[PDB]
Amino acid sequence: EIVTQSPGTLSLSPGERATLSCRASQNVGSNLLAWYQQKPGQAPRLLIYGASNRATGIPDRFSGSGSGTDFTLTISRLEPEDFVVYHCQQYGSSPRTFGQGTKVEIRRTVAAPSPPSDEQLKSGTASVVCLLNNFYPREAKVQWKVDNALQSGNSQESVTEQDSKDSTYSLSSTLTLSKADYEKHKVYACEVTHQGLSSPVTKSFNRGE
């Protein structure tokens, strides 16, 4: 009834074997477990029904196994089109419950990474950006520094999707502060950790253009 999936994100090179787990709080009646594949921004596609039977037209690289509490979806060798989300649904009891989903992402070499505004300050609030680019290992931008001091709850992170032919790209971090705090300080430093790099880059943020 609970059916939780594992792991949250799967990092595997193309052509490798993928193993996705779906566990249940209690035994699923009649092994009525289904696996769906969902591409970004479209309807799910049914892969497996009955926990072992693959649907019509599905390539035989997708297979299902398991019983009772634990079920597994295996992709024998991943195609480039296979790096999408995968859901497990139980339908041996009412109500039918899905899983949280598992993301399969391309694994690659480690990364290649390539002040306040006036009008906004004039307009009141201000937002300082800490941006990055083509990078792989999912950890981009960590901490802010307002006059050598850390802050929490006033910054928002927002990342992109993996690239098509380089499997990379990066995150945007916006620090929002009112006009009473943007002009109150004159430095907006930043420390990044594990960018596939050596030291945090471009941490100079003198108030002014």
Binding site: G29, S30, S94
Partner: protein, 52 residues
């Protein structure tokens, strides 16, 4: 008429067997859950038989 040479069968023996299987624990619950979103589904009973 050679009807006295015919054998003696049991017409609803197979159906009565399915009725008896349906009385086992959880069989009716399996059918009820299967017929939740549709009027027609295939159910595998405890004895390994799949029945519409």
């Amino acid at each position: 008429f050679l009807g006295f040479l015919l054998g003696v069968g049991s017409a609803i023996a197979s159906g009565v067997a399915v009725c008896k299987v349906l009385h086992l624990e959880g069989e009716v619950n399996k059918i009820k859950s299967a017929l939740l979103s549709t009027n027609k589904a295939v159910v595998s009973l405890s004895n390994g038989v799949s029945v519409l």
